Amino acid sequence: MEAKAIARYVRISPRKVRLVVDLIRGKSLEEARNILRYTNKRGAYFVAKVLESAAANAVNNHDMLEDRLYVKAAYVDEGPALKRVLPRARGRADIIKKRTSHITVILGEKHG
Amino acid sequence: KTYVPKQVEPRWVLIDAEGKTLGRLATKIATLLRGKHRPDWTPNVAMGDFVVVVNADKIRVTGKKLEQKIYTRYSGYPGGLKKIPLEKMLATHPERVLEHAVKGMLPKGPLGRRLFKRLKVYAGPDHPHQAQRPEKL
Amino acid sequence: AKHPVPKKKTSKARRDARRSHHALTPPILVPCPECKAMKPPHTVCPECGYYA
Amino acid sequence: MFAIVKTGGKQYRVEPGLKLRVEKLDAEPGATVELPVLLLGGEKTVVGTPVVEGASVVAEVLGHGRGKKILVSKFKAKVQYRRKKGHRQPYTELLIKEIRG
Amino acid sequence: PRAKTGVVRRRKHKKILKLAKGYWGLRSKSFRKARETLFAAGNYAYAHRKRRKRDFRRLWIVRINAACRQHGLNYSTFIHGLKKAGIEVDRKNLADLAVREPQVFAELVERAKAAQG
RNA sequence: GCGGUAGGGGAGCGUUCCCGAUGCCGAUGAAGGCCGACCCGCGAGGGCGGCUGGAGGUAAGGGAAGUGCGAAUGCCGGCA
RNA sequence: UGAGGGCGCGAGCGAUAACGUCCGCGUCCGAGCGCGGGAACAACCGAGACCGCCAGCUAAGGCCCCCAAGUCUGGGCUAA
RNA sequence: GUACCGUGAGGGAAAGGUGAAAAGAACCCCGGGAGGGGAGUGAAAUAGAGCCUGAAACCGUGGGCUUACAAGCAGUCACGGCCCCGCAAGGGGUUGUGGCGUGCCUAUUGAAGCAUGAGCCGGCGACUCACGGUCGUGGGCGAGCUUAAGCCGUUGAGGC
Ligand SMILES: [Mg+2]
Ligand SMILES: [Mg+2]
Ligand SMILES: [Mg+2]
Ligand SMILES: [Mg+2]
Ligand SMILES: [Mg+2]
Ligand SMILES: [Mg+2]
Ligand SMILES: [Mg+2]
Ligand SMILES: [Mg+2]
Ligand SMILES: [Mg+2]
Ligand SMILES: [Mg+2]
Ligand SMILES: [Mg+2]
Ligand SMILES: [Mg+2]
Ligand SMILES: [Mg+2]
Ligand SMILES: [Mg+2]
Ligand SMILES: [Mg+2]
Ligand SMILES: [Mg+2]
Ligand SMILES: [Mg+2]
Ligand SMILES: [Mg+2]
Ligand SMILES: [Mg+2]
Ligand SMILES: [Mg+2]
Ligand SMILES: [Mg+2]
Ligand SMILES: [Mg+2]
Ligand SMILES: [Mg+2]
Ligand SMILES: [Mg+2]
Ligand SMILES: [Mg+2]
Ligand SMILES: [Mg+2]
Ligand SMILES: [Mg+2]
Ligand SMILES: [Mg+2]
Ligand SMILES: [Mg+2]
Ligand SMILES: [Mg+2]
Ligand SMILES: [Mg+2]
Ligand SMILES: [Mg+2]
Ligand SMILES: [Mg+2]
Ligand SMILES: [Mg+2]
Ligand SMILES: [Mg+2]
Ligand SMILES: [Mg+2]
Ligand SMILES: [Mg+2]
Ligand SMILES: [Mg+2]
Ligand SMILES: [Mg+2]
Ligand SMILES: [Mg+2]
Ligand SMILES: [Mg+2]
Ligand SMILES: [Mg+2]
Ligand SMILES: [Mg+2]
Ligand SMILES: [Mg+2]
Ligand SMILES: [Mg+2]
Ligand SMILES: [Mg+2]
Ligand SMILES: [Mg+2]
Ligand SMILES: [Mg+2]
Ligand SMILES: [Mg+2]
Ligand SMILES: [Mg+2]
Ligand SMILES: [Mg+2]
Ligand SMILES: [Mg+2]
Ligand SMILES: [Mg+2]
Ligand SMILES: [Mg+2]
Ligand SMILES: [Mg+2]
Ligand SMILES: [Mg+2]
Ligand SMILES: [Mg+2]
Ligand SMILES: [Mg+2]
Ligand SMILES: [Mg+2]
Ligand SMILES: [Mg+2]
Ligand SMILES: [Mg+2]
Ligand SMILES: [Mg+2]
Ligand SMILES: [Mg+2]
Ligand SMILES: [Mg+2]
Ligand SMILES: [Mg+2]
Ligand SMILES: [Mg+2]
Ligand SMILES: [Mg+2]
Ligand SMILES: [Mg+2]
Ligand SMILES: [Mg+2]
Ligand SMILES: [Mg+2]
Ligand SMILES: [Mg+2]
Ligand SMILES: [Mg+2]
Ligand SMILES: [Mg+2]
Ligand SMILES: [Mg+2]
Ligand SMILES: [Mg+2]
Ligand SMILES: [Mg+2]
Ligand SMILES: [Mg+2]
Ligand SMILES: [Mg+2]
Ligand SMILES: [Mg+2]
Ligand SMILES: [Mg+2]
Ligand SMILES: [Mg+2]
Ligand SMILES: [Mg+2]
Ligand SMILES: [Mg+2]
Ligand SMILES: [Mg+2]
Ligand SMILES: [Mg+2]
Ligand SMILES: [Mg+2]
Ligand SMILES: [Mg+2]
Ligand SMILES: [Mg+2]
Ligand SMILES: [Mg+2]
Ligand SMILES: [Mg+2]
Ligand SMILES: [Mg+2]
Ligand SMILES: [Mg+2]
Ligand SMILES: [Mg+2]
Ligand SMILES: [Mg+2]
Ligand SMILES: [Mg+2]
Ligand SMILES: [Mg+2]
Ligand SMILES: [Mg+2]
Ligand SMILES: [Mg+2]
Ligand SMILES: [Mg+2]
Ligand SMILES: [Mg+2]
Ligand SMILES: [Mg+2]
Ligand SMILES: [Mg+2]
Ligand SMILES: [Mg+2]
């Protein structure tokens, strides 16, 4: 069986966190835990959190053995970004885009 | 539906170059490189003969060509246009002229470079004796 | 706006081709002598201690 | 035995008994139609005078049919000229049998 | 009575886009680039529908000339003799007998030779 | 007999709306959407099949137009 | 529709210059940047494309290799 | 006639949609929350709350095919390999080699032009109507043809 978990509407650029999501893709739970634990990135926080919550969902709702689950799949999409007005020289005014991202991690049983 | 030739078999050949004129010999050689001599002709697969040339330094050529023909070659640098007469070309590596003459007559596409690889030239004679040494003239 | 400007929209293929090297490397770790937990080499870490 | 028939304005080679696609021939949907047009033979029969004067080949008109659509599309720029036609060159599938030349 | 653009403009577009698939880049995603490239493709197709003839004629001719040169004469002598022999046979293509059944090809070589002159 | 710009002529396709409508089609699933290598027409296009969707749709024959977009440094929005 | 243009031919203007200019007769492009040759080359050579064929014959141009077809036959010339 | 703009007169917007009923998701779980995973309600939760239907650009994940000696308006024709639907023959996807190939619209004597316009997608967008002419045209009548305002009627009923 597989077990999903999704943290949506995370106030952070998707492309940025994707670098982190790609670093744990197809890994052991322990492996991913360590990697995210010692990753120098900001996305590490949110990705690891939705990861842990994912494992929790897996064991408590899909009775898998934690001792052998892994990152079956993982990805991140773009949420409705936030446009913000931004001043500039000679009266010109450009708008900034405080983007956002939906992070998704799914796990599964070891082997059979 | 026209015949589609299956997996071919290579065919090595031995060709002399003593007394042979540059142009004509090079032309027949080029014709032999492609499979144009064989009724299984197919322009998109290339399956001609492994042409081998020996005694390249013995190639004839008419007129004051020896002293008058000039081989040009250019590097990206300014004034980098180098040019060497056929006399000095025969002074150093001689087969270079047969190779030039043949390549210049090959199809510009990649398979042309393939056919060019399938072409062996020396001036000894002797060669990779290998297996096949079928002489023609 | 002023002086230099991209003459053409960069193709997505070209863009990602640029992004080729952006990938991250996993942090290098070694198991510590004290606990079972992972440590980054030549550094001490909590849930542990040291000698001398 | 090898055989060369010339029908539909075109010359096909033919084995004894094989399915073939030829230009539409005005005949019954499933009868017999000898092709008096025939050249050469299996054991060599060079057709000196254009057609061999003493040979033939028999075939059954298996069925009529239409070819798959080929879009023709002319377009000359600068003068907004565009033309688009559909097309299906019809045909009959001949089934070859006896090679009684 | 008002009539918006409605379904129409989409449908049409979609249709053209259906042909566009297989093309590189925006040229297969964007309707406009798709249209242009489809035009050029249509013209190329129509032209190459005439190119196919020339191409196959040439291939055949080369093969014929080769196998014919195996016997001693060139393609010009071959066709001269063959057309002079009365054999309007063999739409040049069917000289594929160079490949399979080359003996028949050889007898044809003779029949062309003697009738040539 | 049939290259074809400006241009003239002929024949058609689709959109909305009315008569045909106290009708006929629609939960055994309307309109719209996604998919197709199938059917028909030279073509605009019509039809069938699978999926989605959830309350409308409108024959044959006629009628009337806010009726067909790829460009206007076009307009609005979305996104690179 | 009333900016036309190139080429050949007959003149003016210019300088028996111009991808110059202004007329006259014809031609082709324009509207044939559709097709084969002229390496590429709107108007020079060939030639007026309704559609399909992996049929045939010709045109200009060519028939040593790139590149399809004669290193064809017979007879002279040229040594650059 | 609000937000917002302008000292002022004035300018001037966007923004409608759960479901029959809120039955608006208790309780457990991860989490600081946000957000989810069960469970439950419901015909449907791919109706989960700016929530019916969810198109295109655009961004991602997995898969099939493919590429690191190759010169390209990105296509096309040909054969071949790998992959896939099908008894059959055939067909779909991809692209290896080979032949060929100077974007679209516009403005032009002439464009592939180093002339103009378009980043991309979706929606809005341009030959109408009124009266009066003019030829053609389908009909009614014909040395005649036709009424206008109005009145009567009706409430898509026409008549005088
Ligand atoms: Mg990956
Ligand atoms: Mg943070
Ligand atoms: Mg085929
Ligand atoms: Mg010489
Ligand atoms: Mg070199
Ligand atoms: Mg190429
Ligand atoms: Mg070599
Ligand atoms: Mg990618
Ligand atoms: Mg230490
Ligand atoms: Mg008939
Ligand atoms: Mg019968
Ligand atoms: Mg124009
Ligand atoms: Mg025009
Ligand atoms: Mg419109
Ligand atoms: Mg493709
Ligand atoms: Mg031919
Ligand atoms: Mg005409
Ligand atoms: Mg016409
Ligand atoms: Mg015009
Ligand atoms: Mg309406
Ligand atoms: Mg009504
Ligand atoms: Mg009604
Ligand atoms: Mg129901
Ligand atoms: Mg019912
Ligand atoms: Mg039913
Ligand atoms: Mg249904
Ligand atoms: Mg349903
Ligand atoms: Mg409607
Ligand atoms: Mg409708
Ligand atoms: Mg539907
Ligand atoms: Mg019709
Ligand atoms: Mg269709
Ligand atoms: Mg259809
Ligand atoms: Mg349907
Ligand atoms: Mg209702
Ligand atoms: Mg109607
Ligand atoms: Mg437009
Ligand atoms: Mg536009
Ligand atoms: Mg915009
Ligand atoms: Mg931006
Ligand atoms: Mg005037
Ligand atoms: Mg004038
Ligand atoms: Mg002028
Ligand atoms: Mg004038
Ligand atoms: Mg004129
Ligand atoms: Mg003139
Ligand atoms: Mg002309
Ligand atoms: Mg003009
Ligand atoms: Mg003309
Ligand atoms: Mg041309
Ligand atoms: Mg040319
Ligand atoms: Mg030409
Ligand atoms: Mg020349
Ligand atoms: Mg020249
Ligand atoms: Mg001439
Ligand atoms: Mg047709
Ligand atoms: Mg003739
Ligand atoms: Mg000449
Ligand atoms: Mg001639
Ligand atoms: Mg010669
Ligand atoms: Mg000679
Ligand atoms: Mg000679
Ligand atoms: Mg001679
Ligand atoms: Mg405010
Ligand atoms: Mg002011
Ligand atoms: Mg105020
Ligand atoms: Mg406004
Ligand atoms: Mg409701
Ligand atoms: Mg919940
Ligand atoms: Mg706090
Ligand atoms: Mg339901
Ligand atoms: Mg249902
Ligand atoms: Mg709410
Ligand atoms: Mg609704
Ligand atoms: Mg929705
Ligand atoms: Mg959605
Ligand atoms: Mg979507
Ligand atoms: Mg491979
Ligand atoms: Mg090299
Ligand atoms: Mg090229
Ligand atoms: Mg593979
Ligand atoms: Mg290709
Ligand atoms: Mg390859
Ligand atoms: Mg190619
Ligand atoms: Mg103007
Ligand atoms: Mg210029
Ligand atoms: Mg300018
Ligand atoms: Mg201008
Ligand atoms: Mg423009
Ligand atoms: Mg611009
Ligand atoms: Mg534009
Ligand atoms: Mg737009
Ligand atoms: Mg008008
Ligand atoms: Mg008038
Ligand atoms: Mg008049
Ligand atoms: Mg009329
Ligand atoms: Mg009447
Ligand atoms: Mg009348
Ligand atoms: Mg009358
Ligand atoms: Mg009045
Ligand atoms: Mg009046
Ligand atoms: Mg009244
Ligand atoms: Mg009443």
What one-character-per-residue DSSP string does A13-63 give? -HHHHHHHHHHHSS-BHHHHHHHHHT--SSHHHHHHHHHHHHHHHHHHHH-
Distance CA(B121)–CA(B29), nearest Å, equals: 11
Q: Distance from the CA of B26 to the center of ligand 68, in angstroms? A: 88
Radius of gyration (Cα) for chain C, nearest Å?
A: 23
Tokens at E49, concatenated:
């529908």
Contacts of B43 (CB under 8 A, 6+ apart): B34, E59
Residue given tokens 């090679």 in the structure block: D99
Tokens at D2, concatenated:
């090898």
Q: CA E74, C1' H96: Å apart?
A: 34
**Chain E nearest C-alpha distance from B115 (Å):** 19
Under 8 Å between Cβ of B85 and B69: yes
| End-to-end CA, chain C | 61
Distance CA(B37)–CA(B30), nearest Å, equals: 11
| End-to-end CA, chain B | 36
Tokens at B86, concatenated:
């056929």
- Which residues of chain C are within 8 Å of residue E25 when distances are taken between CB atoms? 11-13
Radius of gyration (Cα) for chain D, nearest Å?
A: 18
Distance CA(B119)–CA(B31), nearest Å, equals: 12
Contact A41 C23 (CB under 8 A): no
Tokens at B17, concatenated:
């170059």
How many CB atoms within 10 Å of residue D46? 18
Contacts of B42 (CB under 8 A, 6+ apart): B4, B5, B35
- In units of Å, what resolution does this entry have? 3.6
Chains B and A touch, contact meaning at least 3 pairs of CB atoms under 8 angstroms apart: no
Radius of gyration (Cα) for chain A, nearest Å?
A: 17
Q: CA C19, C1' H142: Å apart?
A: 91
**How many CB pairs lie under 8 A apart between chains B and E?**
28
How many CB atoms within 10 Å of residue D33? 17
Under 8 Å between Cβ of B59 and B25: yes
> Smallest Cα–Cα separation from D94: which of D65, D64, D60?
D60
Residue given tokens 């992004």 in the structure block: C19
Cα–Cα distances in Å, from B4 out to A99, B42, B43, B47, B94?
58, 8, 12, 13, 40
Exposed / middle / buried, residue E65 (Cβ in 10 Å: 0-12, 13-18, 19+): buried
> Smallest Cα–Cα separation from E88: which of E65, E67, E115?
E115
Distance CA(A73)–CA(A90), nearest Å, equals: 49
Contacts of A71 (CB under 8 A, 6+ apart): A24, A25, A26, A27, A28, A29, A32, A51, A105, A107
Distance CA(E84)–CA(E81), nearest Å, equals: 5
> Smallest Cα–Cα separation from A40: which of B45, D11, C28?
C28
Distance CA(B21)–CA(B61), nearest Å, equals: 6
Exposed / middle / buried, residue C14 (Cβ in 10 Å: 0-12, 13-18, 19+): exposed
Distance CA(D35)–CA(B64), nearest Å, equals: 67
Contact B43 E69 (CB under 8 A): no
Query: What residue spans define the domains of chain A?
Result: 2-110
| AA identity, residue A79 | G
Distance CA(B23)–CA(B94), nearest Å, equals: 15
Distance CA(D20)–CA(D95), nearest Å, equals: 6
Under 8 Å between Cβ of D62 and D95: yes
Q: Distance from the CA of E1 to the center of ligand 96, in angstroms? A: 29
Which residue in chain C has the smallest CA separation from E27?
Answer: C11
Under 8 Å between Cβ of D91 and D59: no
Percent helix / strand / coil, chain D, rounded to 5 = 0, 40, 60
Distance CA(A23)–CA(E37), nearest Å, equals: 40
| AA identity, residue E46 | Y
Under 8 Å between Cβ of E43 and D75: yes
Exposed / middle / buried, residue B30 (Cβ in 10 Å: 0-12, 13-18, 19+): buried
Find the helix or strand (DSSP H, E) in which D9 lies. none
**Chain E nearest C-alpha distance from B106 (Å):** 17
Contacts of E40 (CB under 8 A, 6+ apart): D75
Contacts of E101 (CB under 8 A, 6+ apart): D2
Q: Distance from the CA of D92 to the center of ligand 98, in angstroms? A: 56
- Residues within 5 A (CB) of ion ligand 16: E 57
3-state class (DSSP) for residue A85: strand
> Smallest Cα–Cα separation from A28: which of A70, A68, A73, A65?
A70
Under 8 Å between Cβ of D48 and D84: no
Distance CA(B69)–CA(B85), nearest Å, equals: 6
Find the helix or strand (DSSP H, E) in which D94 lies. strand D91-96
3-state class (DSSP) for residue E73: coil
* CATH (residue range A2-110): 3.90.470.10
Distance CA(E87)–CA(A63), nearest Å, equals: 85
Under 8 Å between Cβ of D48 and E85: yes
Q: Is the peptide bond before B125 cis (omega within 30 degrees of 0)?
A: yes
Distance CA(C13)–CA(E29), nearest Å, equals: 14
Under 8 Å between Cβ of A20 and A41: yes
Tokens at B96, concatenated:
């270079």
